[PDB]
């Protein structure tokens, strides 16, 4: 066994669709990107979707639309990927980190209330492993602190509150109380990066739920303008703002079209693998995050586990013992304050003890659609034997 | 029959290379991007090349490596594409626009000297249509104003002068006094966008000429770090069998090139000398066609320059703004797509809103007023060129009194 962590799942159907684009007159943004956006909108139950070159691009663009900028604050969990936070610093806003709960990755929503100020413009929860956050709660928090809010831009007037922007890089296809991810938070960004559930090798999207206060075409145009240098017998164009360059090509969209056709089948397989893993670890010290709750049906992107009674050293040893057995594994995630970039900005790990405690004993097992049932069986058994073995 | 301005030139060889990447374990950055960077470095005579997802990305990262920022100034010509200027505002620097000469797109190098201040960190000349700028002159200017300069970052100490950063979006393959574009200016960004000479549909690169004061590996690593979220991994974690552990040194960007785009680039680069030759043949046919007429093309062959021949920029003698715009619409009625390179930056809403005023760059405006760009791409047949030549001549004269 040599089990990789997240190989891409690409078949001939994807290759023929890309080849088709390469024989067309449209190799960058064109008809298949528009078609992809249409079909993703239907899938996520949103009116419009903007397809871009990364989820990092989408998330940033969302901030840029809301015109979040210097002196504004944006709240992120301490336990997340660097990308959710980096974009806050790109627009010149100030990140505010919120520690997490004891038995989940989700922010402590009391600490979230306490973190909110008159500067607070946006909250970016992360839908880690595909597991969507407690949005009933999150929407209660922003309504509750709604008098703190003052709208300093066009779109901030439309909402008269903190905008909730979902980092659903892991959560295309997840649902919360039966609704698709993308239709829950005010804005949502998705990732189609090589290692994600749905891939275009590099890509992503921004979308937003139906809301009477948003003209959808106008919002789409605004995203488009910012993604293509601010540009608006037809030679003549103007440039309204010296903007960015993060459009999606029809090469990536071709991949996306086919992935989206195959996607219900990929999800089902990831359900089967997660359920086998779940049975395997029941009764053991290995405690997976739950992909099926009363409110959530996860996309089942990552098999996040934590090992009861493991220290930092013991965890790091377990991972290296897993690789000796031919099992690649990962850690999601170092809390942001462990990272040099965020220490240099004054964030300190001792302020987020729960985030640190989640990270210390966390191990992510392979969860992708090229795993065989026998490989899963092998992972279950080896992980159990290796954990117990890590001993003195 | 209807002639497009810039269709992409893609063959089966490109398609088989992309398919090959799509069957590999590497669909984003991987072995073919590294190989592309290696082969482009050889082609441009530079030690290293960083392949990215746009020339806009490359140009901005060059500025971010030089740590050009708030309170610094960066000089660009008034006659250029918005991308050359936008990246200045992205790093928080202040753009300074310089008007151009009377008979070419190049900046007026006297006005350039006059524009330079103690804040001036970078000059971004544009190699318009593939025509490389007068770099002997440009380097004379920055040496001449070298006492104005004070170095407020690591790489600004390495140079102790204004850094010259070539916008060669149009100029992969162009040469200035026999040297490739990329080896002339201090840094150079290239574009592999769909409509460019060499395409990856979307893409580009940053490179830099050999200079004793630059550790090339260190400069590469710095670009790489900024293109991939600031992520690094130490020697220890890389050696370990499970190499999970990484640090993030700076909350950086996301503009790496995939091996899908690199696959395109590898094949394009093989086919490139042949694409260049064809663009030479088309330009020469056009050149003969317009000789003696009121249609005046920019020259792709000078005593110092052999252009890549990316755009057939022309200006029509004695045409006003209205007459030009009418000529272009008459060209489309005849089935000939055409374009304008470029509206001077100060005509654009974004740059007016930042206080730039068109009346300060009268030569830039005068270049734009009567400029028309004809199709110049490797899907044009000789008969289509013949047709363009004749129609453009007849339509221009038609537009009389
Ligand atoms: C991968 C990832 C992103 C950014 O995705 P890209 O498409 O690579 O920009 C953002 N957030 C999270 C949680 C991720 O895992
Ligand atoms: C197209 C272009 C750019 C930027 O190219 P991308 O690869 O689209 O970022 C920059 N400068 C000039 C002159 C261009 O034509």
GROMACS .gro file of C-alpha atoms in nm, chain A:
model
  392
    1UNK     CA    1   0.000   0.000   0.000
    2UNK     CA    2   0.108   0.348  -0.094
    3UNK     CA    3  -0.187   0.561  -0.033
    4UNK     CA    4  -0.178   0.917  -0.141
    5UNK     CA    5  -0.362   1.192   0.037
    6UNK     CA    6  -0.556   1.365  -0.236
    7UNK     CA    7  -0.482   1.262  -0.592
    8UNK     CA    8  -0.701   1.429  -0.853
    9UNK     CA    9  -0.996   1.224  -0.996
   10UNK     CA   10  -0.980   1.297  -1.371
   11UNK     CA   11  -1.129   1.076  -1.640
   12UNK     CA   12  -1.147   1.088  -2.021
   13UNK     CA   13  -1.473   1.280  -2.019
   14UNK     CA   14  -1.284   1.580  -1.864
   15UNK     CA   15  -1.002   1.547  -2.116
   16UNK     CA   16  -1.236   1.541  -2.417
   17UNK     CA   17  -1.418   1.852  -2.284
   18UNK     CA   18  -1.087   2.038  -2.250
   19UNK     CA   19  -0.970   1.919  -2.592
   20UNK     CA   20  -1.299   2.054  -2.731
   21UNK     CA   21  -1.230   2.399  -2.576
   22UNK     CA   22  -0.879   2.388  -2.724
   23UNK     CA   23  -1.027   2.348  -3.076
   24UNK     CA   24  -1.276   2.632  -3.021
   25UNK     CA   25  -1.228   3.008  -3.057
   26UNK     CA   26  -1.249   3.049  -2.681
   27UNK     CA   27  -0.956   2.924  -2.474
   28UNK     CA   28  -0.990   3.189  -2.190
   29UNK     CA   29  -1.323   3.318  -2.055
   30UNK     CA   30  -1.606   3.232  -2.292
   31UNK     CA   31  -1.925   3.022  -2.336
   32UNK     CA   32  -1.829   2.726  -2.107
   33UNK     CA   33  -1.745   2.950  -1.811
   34UNK     CA   34  -2.087   3.118  -1.847
   35UNK     CA   35  -2.249   2.774  -1.872
   36UNK     CA   36  -2.054   2.654  -1.566
   37UNK     CA   37  -2.172   2.956  -1.366
   38UNK     CA   38  -2.535   2.886  -1.472
   39UNK     CA   39  -2.517   2.520  -1.372
   40UNK     CA   40  -2.341   2.592  -1.038
   41UNK     CA   41  -2.609   2.852  -0.957
   42UNK     CA   42  -2.876   2.579  -1.000
   43UNK     CA   43  -2.675   2.337  -0.788
   44UNK     CA   44  -2.622   2.583  -0.501
   45UNK     CA   45  -2.964   2.747  -0.529
   46UNK     CA   46  -2.824   3.091  -0.594
   47UNK     CA   47  -2.934   3.332  -0.871
   48UNK     CA   48  -2.579   3.396  -1.002
   49UNK     CA   49  -2.226   3.261  -0.970
   50UNK     CA   50  -1.896   3.424  -1.068
   51UNK     CA   51  -1.632   3.169  -1.172
   52UNK     CA   52  -1.275   3.281  -1.098
   53UNK     CA   53  -0.917   3.144  -1.086
   54UNK     CA   54  -0.915   3.063  -0.716
   55UNK     CA   55  -1.127   3.067  -0.399
   56UNK     CA   56  -0.867   3.311  -0.267
   57UNK     CA   57  -0.953   3.542  -0.556
   58UNK     CA   58  -1.329   3.499  -0.488
   59UNK     CA   59  -1.308   3.566  -0.118
   60UNK     CA   60  -1.098   3.875  -0.177
   61UNK     CA   61  -1.331   3.995  -0.447
   62UNK     CA   62  -1.623   3.966  -0.211
   63UNK     CA   63  -1.452   4.195   0.034
   64UNK     CA   64  -1.370   4.431  -0.252
   65UNK     CA   65  -1.731   4.447  -0.358
   66UNK     CA   66  -1.838   4.520  -0.001
   67UNK     CA   67  -1.552   4.770  -0.015
   68UNK     CA   68  -1.409   4.644   0.315
   69UNK     CA   69  -1.086   4.839   0.367
   70UNK     CA   70  -0.848   5.019   0.604
   71UNK     CA   71  -0.993   5.066   0.957
   72UNK     CA   72  -1.258   4.796   0.907
   73UNK     CA   73  -1.243   4.466   1.093
   74UNK     CA   74  -1.316   4.121   0.963
   75UNK     CA   75  -1.366   3.824   1.191
   76UNK     CA   76  -1.216   3.481   1.118
   77UNK     CA   77  -1.168   3.179   1.333
   78UNK     CA   78  -0.825   3.110   1.469
   79UNK     CA   79  -0.860   2.753   1.332
   80UNK     CA   80  -0.866   2.796   0.957
   81UNK     CA   81  -0.655   2.800   0.642
   82UNK     CA   82  -0.431   3.103   0.584
   83UNK     CA   83  -0.632   3.197   0.270
   84UNK     CA   84  -0.946   3.292   0.475
   85UNK     CA   85  -0.736   3.546   0.665
   86UNK     CA   86  -0.475   3.665   0.404
   87UNK     CA   87  -0.741   3.836   0.192
   88UNK     CA   88  -0.839   4.058   0.491
   89UNK     CA   89  -0.484   4.196   0.494
   90UNK     CA   90  -0.486   4.237   0.110
   91UNK     CA   91  -0.775   4.488   0.126
   92UNK     CA   92  -0.603   4.674   0.412
   93UNK     CA   93  -0.861   4.561   0.672
   94UNK     CA   94  -0.771   4.434   1.020
   95UNK     CA   95  -0.823   4.068   1.100
   96UNK     CA   96  -0.984   3.971   1.428
   97UNK     CA   97  -0.933   3.612   1.536
   98UNK     CA   98  -1.193   3.422   1.740
   99UNK     CA   99  -1.115   3.107   1.935
  100UNK     CA  100  -1.317   2.788   1.883
  101UNK     CA  101  -1.538   2.555   2.087
  102UNK     CA  102  -1.409   2.254   2.290
  103UNK     CA  103  -1.566   1.974   2.081
  104UNK     CA  104  -1.570   2.126   1.732
  105UNK     CA  105  -1.382   2.350   1.489
  106UNK     CA  106  -1.662   2.609   1.492
  107UNK     CA  107  -1.598   2.948   1.653
  108UNK     CA  108  -1.711   2.999   2.015
  109UNK     CA  109  -2.014   3.212   1.932
  110UNK     CA  110  -2.006   3.386   2.269
  111UNK     CA  111  -1.644   3.498   2.197
  112UNK     CA  112  -1.768   3.601   1.851
  113UNK     CA  113  -2.030   3.836   2.003
  114UNK     CA  114  -1.755   3.975   2.230
  115UNK     CA  115  -1.519   4.024   1.936
  116UNK     CA  116  -1.776   4.236   1.739
  117UNK     CA  117  -1.722   4.617   1.728
  118UNK     CA  118  -1.834   4.925   1.536
  119UNK     CA  119  -1.548   4.843   1.292
  120UNK     CA  120  -1.681   4.489   1.223
  121UNK     CA  121  -1.792   4.452   0.862
  122UNK     CA  122  -1.769   4.081   0.783
  123UNK     CA  123  -1.752   3.738   0.953
  124UNK     CA  124  -1.582   3.459   0.754
  125UNK     CA  125  -1.669   3.123   0.904
  126UNK     CA  126  -1.498   2.817   0.751
  127UNK     CA  127  -1.699   2.505   0.658
  128UNK     CA  128  -1.419   2.273   0.761
  129UNK     CA  129  -1.406   1.927   0.603
  130UNK     CA  130  -1.744   2.003   0.439
  131UNK     CA  131  -1.920   2.051   0.770
  132UNK     CA  132  -2.133   2.368   0.750
  133UNK     CA  133  -2.140   2.602   1.051
  134UNK     CA  134  -2.423   2.681   1.291
  135UNK     CA  135  -2.575   2.957   1.073
  136UNK     CA  136  -2.895   3.002   1.279
  137UNK     CA  137  -2.666   3.107   1.559
  138UNK     CA  138  -2.437   3.323   1.336
  139UNK     CA  139  -2.731   3.517   1.193
  140UNK     CA  140  -2.867   3.566   1.548
  141UNK     CA  141  -2.530   3.717   1.648
  142UNK     CA  142  -2.519   3.978   1.370
  143UNK     CA  143  -2.885   4.083   1.420
  144UNK     CA  144  -2.810   4.103   1.793
  145UNK     CA  145  -2.510   4.335   1.739
  146UNK     CA  146  -2.681   4.524   1.451
  147UNK     CA  147  -2.666   4.863   1.632
  148UNK     CA  148  -2.283   4.838   1.640
  149UNK     CA  149  -2.292   4.843   1.256
  150UNK     CA  150  -2.259   5.153   1.036
  151UNK     CA  151  -2.261   5.118   0.656
  152UNK     CA  152  -1.967   5.290   0.482
  153UNK     CA  153  -2.029   5.167   0.127
  154UNK     CA  154  -2.302   5.099  -0.127
  155UNK     CA  155  -2.333   4.725  -0.058
  156UNK     CA  156  -2.287   4.771   0.316
  157UNK     CA  157  -2.608   4.988   0.301
  158UNK     CA  158  -2.797   4.713   0.124
  159UNK     CA  159  -2.729   4.491   0.425
  160UNK     CA  160  -2.750   4.704   0.734
  161UNK     CA  161  -2.551   4.457   0.928
  162UNK     CA  162  -2.233   4.249   0.945
  163UNK     CA  163  -2.217   4.050   0.622
  164UNK     CA  164  -2.152   3.676   0.673
  165UNK     CA  165  -1.921   3.536   0.400
  166UNK     CA  166  -1.880   3.162   0.393
  167UNK     CA  167  -1.540   3.008   0.321
  168UNK     CA  168  -1.686   2.693   0.161
  169UNK     CA  169  -1.359   2.584  -0.007
  170UNK     CA  170  -1.438   2.235   0.129
  171UNK     CA  171  -1.820   2.250   0.110
  172UNK     CA  172  -1.953   2.249  -0.246
  173UNK     CA  173  -2.247   2.009  -0.203
  174UNK     CA  174  -2.277   2.031   0.178
  175UNK     CA  175  -2.616   2.122   0.322
  176UNK     CA  176  -2.738   2.286   0.637
  177UNK     CA  177  -3.102   2.217   0.732
  178UNK     CA  178  -3.152   2.087   0.379
  179UNK     CA  179  -3.030   2.401   0.196
  180UNK     CA  180  -2.722   2.395  -0.028
  181UNK     CA  181  -2.397   2.562   0.073
  182UNK     CA  182  -2.392   2.888  -0.118
  183UNK     CA  183  -2.754   2.971  -0.026
  184UNK     CA  184  -2.695   2.999   0.349
  185UNK     CA  185  -2.440   3.278   0.418
  186UNK     CA  186  -2.463   3.625   0.257
  187UNK     CA  187  -2.173   3.546   0.023
  188UNK     CA  188  -1.993   3.221  -0.036
  189UNK     CA  189  -1.664   3.133  -0.203
  190UNK     CA  190  -1.580   2.787  -0.332
  191UNK     CA  191  -1.250   2.624  -0.429
  192UNK     CA  192  -1.191   2.398  -0.728
  193UNK     CA  193  -0.823   2.353  -0.649
  194UNK     CA  194  -0.659   2.020  -0.750
  195UNK     CA  195  -0.702   1.861  -0.397
  196UNK     CA  196  -1.065   1.975  -0.342
  197UNK     CA  197  -1.386   1.757  -0.395
  198UNK     CA  198  -1.470   1.931  -0.722
  199UNK     CA  199  -1.161   2.035  -0.915
  200UNK     CA  200  -1.058   2.250  -1.211
  201UNK     CA  201  -0.693   2.209  -1.100
  202UNK     CA  202  -0.699   2.580  -1.013
  203UNK     CA  203  -1.025   2.766  -0.977
  204UNK     CA  204  -1.317   2.877  -0.766
  205UNK     CA  205  -1.629   3.085  -0.748
  206UNK     CA  206  -1.815   3.359  -0.563
  207UNK     CA  207  -2.194   3.344  -0.516
  208UNK     CA  208  -2.455   3.497  -0.285
  209UNK     CA  209  -2.795   3.399  -0.160
  210UNK     CA  210  -3.115   3.549  -0.296
  211UNK     CA  211  -3.186   3.871  -0.116
  212UNK     CA  212  -3.446   4.134  -0.223
  213UNK     CA  213  -3.193   4.415  -0.163
  214UNK     CA  214  -2.943   4.285  -0.428
  215UNK     CA  215  -2.978   4.345  -0.797
  216UNK     CA  216  -2.814   4.017  -0.910
  217UNK     CA  217  -2.707   4.130  -1.257
  218UNK     CA  218  -2.554   4.444  -1.109
  219UNK     CA  219  -2.365   4.236  -0.849
  220UNK     CA  220  -2.249   3.996  -1.122
  221UNK     CA  221  -2.128   4.289  -1.340
  222UNK     CA  222  -1.937   4.431  -1.041
  223UNK     CA  223  -1.753   4.101  -0.982
  224UNK     CA  224  -1.680   4.074  -1.354
  225UNK     CA  225  -1.543   4.428  -1.371
  226UNK     CA  226  -1.306   4.363  -1.079
  227UNK     CA  227  -1.187   4.027  -1.223
  228UNK     CA  228  -1.089   4.171  -1.566
  229UNK     CA  229  -0.886   4.488  -1.500
  230UNK     CA  230  -1.192   4.709  -1.432
  231UNK     CA  231  -1.285   4.702  -1.798
  232UNK     CA  232  -1.639   4.807  -1.914
  233UNK     CA  233  -1.757   4.707  -3.448
  234UNK     CA  234  -1.689   4.753  -3.075
  235UNK     CA  235  -1.328   4.857  -2.984
  236UNK     CA  236  -1.411   5.123  -2.722
  237UNK     CA  237  -1.385   5.037  -2.350
  238UNK     CA  238  -1.331   5.228  -2.026
  239UNK     CA  239  -1.149   5.123  -1.713
  240UNK     CA  240  -1.351   5.231  -1.408
  241UNK     CA  241  -1.106   5.119  -1.135
  242UNK     CA  242  -0.752   4.978  -1.162
  243UNK     CA  243  -0.869   4.627  -1.081
  244UNK     CA  244  -0.754   4.264  -1.086
  245UNK     CA  245  -0.700   3.965  -1.306
  246UNK     CA  246  -0.862   3.649  -1.189
  247UNK     CA  247  -1.103   3.531  -1.451
  248UNK     CA  248  -1.157   3.162  -1.520
  249UNK     CA  249  -1.060   3.015  -1.857
  250UNK     CA  250  -1.289   2.784  -2.057
  251UNK     CA  251  -1.012   2.527  -2.014
  252UNK     CA  252  -1.087   2.519  -1.638
  253UNK     CA  253  -1.459   2.553  -1.696
  254UNK     CA  254  -1.449   2.243  -1.924
  255UNK     CA  255  -1.315   2.042  -1.631
  256UNK     CA  256  -1.582   2.193  -1.408
  257UNK     CA  257  -1.869   2.105  -1.641
  258UNK     CA  258  -1.774   1.738  -1.643
  259UNK     CA  259  -1.690   1.727  -1.265
  260UNK     CA  260  -2.033   1.870  -1.193
  261UNK     CA  261  -2.197   1.592  -1.401
  262UNK     CA  262  -1.997   1.330  -1.214
  263UNK     CA  263  -2.039   1.510  -0.878
  264UNK     CA  264  -2.343   1.333  -0.720
  265UNK     CA  265  -2.160   1.003  -0.785
  266UNK     CA  266  -1.832   1.137  -0.629
  267UNK     CA  267  -2.026   1.256  -0.321
  268UNK     CA  268  -2.193   0.914  -0.281
  269UNK     CA  269  -1.853   0.738  -0.289
  270UNK     CA  270  -1.719   0.980  -0.027
  271UNK     CA  271  -2.030   0.895   0.185
  272UNK     CA  272  -1.944   0.523   0.152
  273UNK     CA  273  -1.579   0.576   0.253
  274UNK     CA  274  -1.675   0.800   0.550
  275UNK     CA  275  -1.926   0.542   0.680
  276UNK     CA  276  -1.670   0.258   0.656
  277UNK     CA  277  -1.416   0.477   0.843
  278UNK     CA  278  -1.682   0.570   1.099
  279UNK     CA  279  -1.762   0.206   1.179
  280UNK     CA  280  -1.389   0.126   1.196
  281UNK     CA  281  -1.309   0.389   1.462
  282UNK     CA  282  -1.619   0.343   1.675
  283UNK     CA  283  -1.515   0.252   2.031
  284UNK     CA  284  -1.148   0.353   1.967
  285UNK     CA  285  -0.946   0.658   2.074
  286UNK     CA  286  -0.966   0.796   1.719
  287UNK     CA  287  -1.251   1.056   1.714
  288UNK     CA  288  -1.355   1.181   1.371
  289UNK     CA  289  -1.547   1.498   1.306
  290UNK     CA  290  -1.902   1.394   1.223
  291UNK     CA  291  -2.008   1.440   0.859
  292UNK     CA  292  -2.367   1.368   0.935
  293UNK     CA  293  -2.542   1.570   1.209
  294UNK     CA  294  -2.908   1.673   1.270
  295UNK     CA  295  -2.845   1.997   1.082
  296UNK     CA  296  -2.562   1.905   0.843
  297UNK     CA  297  -2.495   1.663   0.562
  298UNK     CA  298  -2.133   1.734   0.479
  299UNK     CA  299  -1.979   1.716   0.131
  300UNK     CA  300  -1.723   1.489   0.309
  301UNK     CA  301  -1.411   1.656   0.186
  302UNK     CA  302  -1.163   1.574   0.469
  303UNK     CA  303  -1.162   1.294   0.721
  304UNK     CA  304  -1.057   1.504   1.014
  305UNK     CA  305  -0.982   1.297   1.327
  306UNK     CA  306  -0.845   1.376   1.674
  307UNK     CA  307  -0.664   1.111   1.881
  308UNK     CA  308  -0.770   1.107   2.251
  309UNK     CA  309  -0.478   1.159   2.488
  310UNK     CA  310  -0.214   1.242   2.221
  311UNK     CA  311   0.029   1.527   2.277
  312UNK     CA  312   0.188   1.734   1.995
  313UNK     CA  313   0.495   1.510   1.978
  314UNK     CA  314   0.289   1.193   1.985
  315UNK     CA  315   0.067   1.317   1.701
  316UNK     CA  316   0.367   1.413   1.486
  317UNK     CA  317   0.513   1.068   1.552
  318UNK     CA  318   0.184   0.899   1.458
  319UNK     CA  319   0.178   1.078   1.124
  320UNK     CA  320   0.538   0.963   1.046
  321UNK     CA  321   0.453   0.609   1.152
  322UNK     CA  322   0.149   0.627   0.917
  323UNK     CA  323   0.379   0.719   0.624
  324UNK     CA  324   0.611   0.427   0.712
  325UNK     CA  325   0.300   0.206   0.660
  326UNK     CA  326   0.235   0.366   0.323
  327UNK     CA  327  -0.043   0.604   0.447
  328UNK     CA  328  -0.018   0.972   0.362
  329UNK     CA  329  -0.190   1.199   0.617
  330UNK     CA  330  -0.222   1.566   0.697
  331UNK     CA  331  -0.303   1.827   0.956
  332UNK     CA  332  -0.589   2.071   0.921
  333UNK     CA  333  -0.478   2.304   1.069
  334UNK     CA  334  -0.203   2.490   1.247
  335UNK     CA  335  -0.397   2.768   1.421
  336UNK     CA  336  -0.323   3.095   1.243
  337UNK     CA  337  -0.128   3.238   1.539
  338UNK     CA  338   0.131   2.962   1.507
  339UNK     CA  339   0.220   3.099   1.158
  340UNK     CA  340   0.505   3.354   1.128
  341UNK     CA  341   0.288   3.592   0.922
  342UNK     CA  342   0.022   3.620   1.190
  343UNK     CA  343   0.267   3.637   1.487
  344UNK     CA  344   0.432   3.930   1.308
  345UNK     CA  345   0.092   4.098   1.300
  346UNK     CA  346   0.064   4.060   1.680
  347UNK     CA  347  -0.159   3.749   1.710
  348UNK     CA  348  -0.059   3.523   2.001
  349UNK     CA  349  -0.142   3.155   2.035
  350UNK     CA  350  -0.208   3.173   2.410
  351UNK     CA  351  -0.522   3.381   2.337
  352UNK     CA  352  -0.679   3.086   2.147
  353UNK     CA  353  -0.622   2.784   2.370
  354UNK     CA  354  -0.911   2.581   2.217
  355UNK     CA  355  -0.778   2.627   1.864
  356UNK     CA  356  -0.438   2.506   1.983
  357UNK     CA  357  -0.599   2.207   2.157
  358UNK     CA  358  -0.789   2.107   1.838
  359UNK     CA  359  -0.463   2.120   1.635
  360UNK     CA  360  -0.243   1.935   1.886
  361UNK     CA  361  -0.397   1.593   1.835
  362UNK     CA  362  -0.563   1.629   1.494
  363UNK     CA  363  -0.486   1.395   1.207
  364UNK     CA  364  -0.654   1.400   0.869
  365UNK     CA  365  -0.681   1.068   0.684
  366UNK     CA  366  -0.714   1.031   0.308
  367UNK     CA  367  -1.063   1.093   0.188
  368UNK     CA  368  -1.084   1.094  -0.190
  369UNK     CA  369  -1.259   0.894  -0.468
  370UNK     CA  370  -0.955   0.692  -0.580
  371UNK     CA  371  -0.941   0.500  -0.245
  372UNK     CA  372  -1.044   0.134  -0.260
  373UNK     CA  373  -1.244  -0.025   0.025
  374UNK     CA  374  -0.937  -0.238   0.106
  375UNK     CA  375  -0.717   0.069   0.138
  376UNK     CA  376  -0.973   0.219   0.380
  377UNK     CA  377  -0.979  -0.111   0.577
  378UNK     CA  378  -0.599  -0.096   0.586
  379UNK     CA  379  -0.599   0.267   0.706
  380UNK     CA  380  -0.852   0.194   0.980
  381UNK     CA  381  -0.649  -0.100   1.112
  382UNK     CA  382  -0.302   0.058   1.080
  383UNK     CA  383  -0.411   0.391   1.234
  384UNK     CA  384  -0.555   0.199   1.532
  385UNK     CA  385  -0.243  -0.018   1.572
  386UNK     CA  386   0.000   0.280   1.523
  387UNK     CA  387  -0.182   0.504   1.771
  388UNK     CA  388  -0.179   0.234   2.045
  389UNK     CA  389   0.188   0.162   1.954
  390UNK     CA  390   0.284   0.527   2.014
  391UNK     CA  391   0.350   0.447   2.381
  392UNK     CA  392   0.604   0.456   2.672
   0.00000   0.00000   0.00000
